Amino acid sequence: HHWGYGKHNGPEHWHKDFPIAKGERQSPVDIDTHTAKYDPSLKPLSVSYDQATSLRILNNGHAFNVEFDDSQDKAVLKGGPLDGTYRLIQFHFHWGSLDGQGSEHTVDKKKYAAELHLVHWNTKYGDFGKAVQQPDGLAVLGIFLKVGSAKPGLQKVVDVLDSIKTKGKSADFTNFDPRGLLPESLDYWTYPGSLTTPPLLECVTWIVLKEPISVSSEQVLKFRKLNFNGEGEPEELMVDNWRPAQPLKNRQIKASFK
Ligand SMILES: COP(=O)(OC)[C@H](Nc1ccc(S(N)(=O)=O)cc1)c1ccc([C@@H](Nc2ccc(S(N)(=O)=O)cc2)P(=O)(OC)OC)cc1
Numbered sequence: 001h002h003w004g005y006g007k008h009n010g011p012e013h014w015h016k017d018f019p020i021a022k023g024e025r026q027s028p029v030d031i032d033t034h035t036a037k038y039d040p041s042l043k044p045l046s047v048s049y050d051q052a053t054s055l056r057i058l059n060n061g062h063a064f065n066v067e068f069d070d071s072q073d074k075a076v077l078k079g080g081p082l083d084g085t086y087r088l089i090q091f092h093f094h095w096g097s098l099d100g101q102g103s104e105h106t107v108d109k110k111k112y113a114a115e116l117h118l119v120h121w122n123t124k125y126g127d128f129g130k131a132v133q134q135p136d137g138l139a140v141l142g143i144f145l146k147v148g149s150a151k152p153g154l155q156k157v158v159d160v161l162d163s164i165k166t167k168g169k170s171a172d173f174t175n176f177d178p179r180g181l182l183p184e185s186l187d188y189w190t191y192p193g194s195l196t197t198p199p200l201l202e203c204v205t206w207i208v209l210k211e212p213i214s215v216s217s218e219q220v221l222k223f224r225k226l227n228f229n230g231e232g233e234p235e236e237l238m239v240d241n242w243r244p245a246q247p248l249k250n251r252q253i254k255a256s257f258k
């Protein structure tokens with residue numbers, strides 16, 4: 001009886017095995033655009049992905065992760081609200097069963113079809129496992145997806161999903177450029193929060209981009225053909241793998257833009 005996104009093991013249950021679920025800095029949150037304050041002192045965000053080295057794509061039973069070589073400063077995130085250098089380790093998505101749901105963060109209570117999380121860790125802590133134990137250990141860049149025109153840079157991802165249908169399957173995924181997943185603007189909101197799945201550690205500086213990317217209906221349909229189950233088990237489609245918005249508590253969301 002492990003955690004997931006079903007009636008019996010979903011977000012409302014997680015607090016029993018992970019009491020930090022009811023903590024002071026949980027994610028995601030609703031972004032109230034009229035309460036978020038422009039902070040003129042936020043530095044300009046630096047996304048340096050030209051030397052990124054993708055390795056593999058994995059169905060972990062919750063989402064699929066595109067994993068990178070993070071054993072050197074290749075693909076890094078700096079600037080914005082960040083102090084120091086954060087290395088890209090993986091990206092994944094959260095998505096819905098229908099186009100009106102699937103994001104984790106919300107904007108004035110609007111839910112997007114999906115949300116992309118590019119996960120980075122602070123190199124001052126030496127490895128990712130040490131970093132998740134620190135309040136400033138991780139930086140996750142969140143990008144909303146809406147359904148409309150195709151995103152060309154997503155197609156290579158879409159096309160390998162058939163090979164990783166079930167939990168525990170992986171495939172070689174070299175030479176993928178995550179720059180192709182960004183929107184034109186790097187305008188963002190930032191706040192201190194958490195992992196959005198167990199173990200729900202309060203270790204993340206969230207950076208959520210204002211501008212969504214557009215994907216096609218056909219692209220998100222292929223996400224929804226993935227399985228939460230393992231091979232040879234009854235089929236449970238991998239849909240609605242998102243945590244709803246959590247209380248903001250004693251936090252301020254800052255805007256990089258006027
Ligand atoms: C394995 O999943 P993951 O992607 O990490 C590669 C996930 N990571 C993950 C990444 C991103 C996101 S999201 N959706 O972008 O927020 C969610 C989960 C995550 C899972 C588990 C942990 C650790 N869990 C953990 C629990 C408590 C503590 S403690 N003593 O309280 O400090 C320490 C470690 P670990 O497996 O060691 C890394 O140790 C049991 C760590 C990470």
Ligand SMILES: [Zn+2]
Binds near residue numbers: 092093094117196
């Ligand atoms: Zn995530």
